[model samples]
Target: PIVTNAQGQMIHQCISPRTLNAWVKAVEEKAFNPEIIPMFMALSCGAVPYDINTMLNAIGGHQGALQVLKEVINEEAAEWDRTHPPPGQIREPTGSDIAGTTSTQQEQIIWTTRGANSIPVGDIYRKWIVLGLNKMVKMYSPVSILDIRQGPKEPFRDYVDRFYKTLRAETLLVQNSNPDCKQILKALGPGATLEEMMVACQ
Candidate 1:
């Protein structure tokens, strides 16, 4: 869900207080890598790709999250201005204007010039996307493509199925369609007719 404030800004009504606290601690400890928090949040919350609020809502419920969020923005606002300087001037509301800026910048910005209570909503998903990608790096197999071949007389369908099954069985590697697609395409011999068809699959 989403809520719009008196300043004409929108806030996503997700995020649990616990999640907010964890985020706060991370920030306080300077552990908020600016790259991995979102991935952790989404994994905890089971959010879909690009769903920032759902990801932030990992700790508990909507209202609680927002309650904590209020404090968080309040806490961070001054620091945000301190770190950013001219562009980060909260009082002027440049990028801080929730009504004017996009969500990613909004999440990074945190507060309005008016005050802490006057803060805008969320853009955490993409920010989380960056983090998730960062987190996935460790889990990502350096070489997802296994160098193997279709056996002689192996029907294209059977070989393709076997190839994917083999890929799926490699639990250490992260599963993604793009890498699988590339591997499958490479596995096909020049004589194979299904290369074009396989490319069509996501």
Candidate 2:
């Protein structure tokens, strides 16, 4: 949630007045990293946001996490600006008509300006993908691809199953699919058949 002033400055809603005040104090002391405050607010507020953590440490620690917080607020502001433009800005459409700007065009511009390809969002997701890759790095078996190979007469099905089990047992995959597949590929070793492991056989 967020609070907006008459001037349109947006404010993040903290868990409570006390939580916001604490952030303010932290600001004064410069005792906190810029990224953490948003995650602090998110947890305080009611957004567990699924597995947003361990994954969020991709680029910099909490910075992107905080950026997602800002994205949430920016998205809301765009909505409010369209629905509740301030007095005098109200057009026939309720938003004050800016010089030579069509309502449809304005809406399109706002919507398109921030998208999957846009900065931050794509960056965030790419970093998340890298995180997934990183988790399975050990499964790459830098020490030996031999460690990943199937034993003699081991059927492909059996080997795939074994890799899935061993990957999980080694903590190579957890709570997600893309990473799980990568872990399987690593354990499958080079030039192995194209197999996409789905679950841990559970």
Candidate 3:
């Protein structure tokens, strides 16, 4: 049901495809007022508040309402299916490497929250620069590791604690030069036992 509020704004539920086709026909017959028909047209296609706003904002711009509606619906549905995929819809994993192309046939490759957490911080930094996606900005805050510094004469235990805090903040520097030596606690602090280093790195 489409409700007309006191402000003349039309708040509507998502409409159906059959209704959309009917409205399109009604539009051709000039039965509805042209000025308000665009909103009705979008409602007919199940467009939500954001979709309606997007269409209206670009009403007289590069795209027609119909064109923009098509784009928004397709894009939204694509992303919707990406995250809310149906069972067995995703194909088996292929031989493609990480950061592979976006082919619909294969499983959708997206940077997931927990998935990113499992990966190396340095690799995350590397991928952000190399893969051309900036989504990692939100999970970890804005700064990288280069600006991080240990306190003057900071104890090994305190340094480890500070290193962890810095790591959590994503301020740890990228260490691709020597992957083995990237374990800061083990490499820098000889006093730390192997088990302690293992626990810290893990």
Candidate 4:
């Protein structure tokens, strides 16, 4: 299971309680029905089960492994973002760019004013989560279970490879789910092919 720090953050310490709470509240109030509120409330109460950090530490001493994984992902994402700056394609106005436009047209203008390039950022973040989770599982065998008593050790390539395999399988399961898979794929972007997304920090 994923361990948490004193502040109730993930063992990886990536997310804070405030962030989780806000997300839970947003989903409960806007996306989900009141019936699902209890489920969200339960998750909000503790660490994520089988989270990455807990797995990594459990897989034996792999000192600096998590840091190495984090650095590699950050560097890769930075590079990808630099190369693919958002393509801001704007639609030409059918009539005139004058003041008497309808309320709908005015609303469109307001929405389009904000650059819609943040989709890639969201895609990268999701890829990072899957990658990070897989890495944790690979670092330790019996990857299905969570152990929290181990210490950190030097980075091992074998563990990294193991993580990749497990992650690929999990991702495949997600992709096979039809419309839900398509929705996730669209958000991830065509450039984010599964092979490219699955990289081991050697």
Candidate 5:
């Protein structure tokens, strides 16, 4: 329900899409006086105060009450998109050759968070970079490790190369280069040898 106060402001509840749509149409019909702009919107936005207020401010030089309010909605959405930082881009794929085009994929990701436009890659990696040795650690964030499942028909050297790739890709220079090595060592089944050396040495 909508109410009017002594100041003539409209006290709004959350207006339905139908209500808002009708009101925009009201403006088209020249049904309401412009002075009532604030009043109508106030009723239009009781559920969230700032949303209505913010959008109201979007009234452009050319558009009147309704058009500007419409612009406000669009502007607010854009504002969110710019700052949201989006999802942690491109999950480091797990379990494959850490080979062939993995570096290419990783490079594109490094460029965005680590800087490219005249910014030193090393410098950006210094702080805001997410994902490092541990979850809390940052800078030299975990490389988006390329997946590296050994092929069924693969030769011994290829498997060894993939194992090393996991270690190097996951281990940060600032930290020990053996965390992935440790984890993979444990996960490997019994009868897999080099065995304790997998744990004993990187």
Candidate 6:
């Protein structure tokens, strides 16, 4: 004889498509405000070094760029989910829950304080150069020239050289304002001459 079980329990994992759609719509709406949303997302996502400049230009020049920014965020989220599977729990950890974890909080504080200092000087220089170039492009709208000898052409190389020279000169002017500058000048120990410092500046 066969007997049917009297008691049983069923478990299910359910995802609501409507809820997902609502979240997607909300993100789309937020993308319209690039200055606030895109900038914050770019910083948080650890985007490529030059991405900050590119994102700034996109935000300042074109509102449609926010859609591109949203796409990047979505892609990064998907990649993270692929690597780290969610635990089989009713509710995932909240932001405060994660922050309360000692190791996570310490890492966050250290990264916020020290990460910028660790960025290479060259990366900072390039970001500044790109931003400056974008400003110049906005200020002076010039027709693209194919050849310099045949027609009018802006000598970009000369412009960049002048820009760097001006930056160095301005930096020195500021540095010379402090008493420490005078001490450094005086402490050209033995063989070290003022000419050496001049070359170092160059």
Tens digit per residue, CA lDDT, model 5, 1-202? 3345689654434446665655455444533332233434443432232223322333333234334333443444345336533366443321110111122323323333343342222222221111111221122224333445445454435555555545543322112324544455556545565535344433
TM-score between candidate 2 and the true structure:
0.21
lDDT tens per residue, model 6, 40-128: 34332432222333334433343444445334434444454465455441223222222222223223323233434332222332333
Best model per lDDT: 1
- Model 4, span 1-202: residue lDDT tens: 1344689543322346554555545543533222333443343333222222332233333445556556656655556546645335443322111111222332333332336522222223334534543554344434332221112342323433444444433343224323533454456555565443333111
My TM-score estimates for the predictions, one after another, are 0.30, 0.21, 0.22, 0.26, 0.20, 0.23
Model 2 regions more than 4 Å off = 1-136, 139-143, 148-156, 160-202
User: What lDDT would candidate 5 get against the real structure?
Assistant: 0.36
RMSD, each candidate, Å? 12.6, 15.4, 20.5, 21.6, 26.3, 19.2
* Prediction 1 TM-score vs. true: 0.30
Superposed by TM-score, candidate 1 places the C-alpha of residue 160 at a distance from the truth, in angstroms, of: 2.8
Sorted by TM-score (best first), the order is 1, 4, 6, 3, 2, 5
**lDDT, candidate 6, residue 141?**
31
lDDT of each: 0.42, 0.36, 0.36, 0.37, 0.36, 0.33
Q: Model 2 clash pairs?
A: 89-96, 90-96, 91-94, 91-95
Q: How would you encode candidate 2's per-residue C-alpha lDDT over 1-202 as one tens digit per residue?
A: 2445689644333235554455445434532333333434443342111222222322343353345544543444455457755553223322112111233333322322333332222123233333333333333233332255554444456655555644533332222224434455466444443333332222
Tens digit of lDDT per residue, candidate 3, span 1-202?
2345689644544344565555445434532222233434444243333222332343333234344444444444455357544463333322121122223211222221124333222122222222111122223243444444444444445545545554554313223212433556436555655456545544
Tell me how many clashing residue pairs each candidate has.
4, 4, 1, 4, 9, 0
Among these predictions, the greatest TM-score belongs to 1
Judging by lDDT, tell me the better candidate of 1 and 5.
Answer: 1
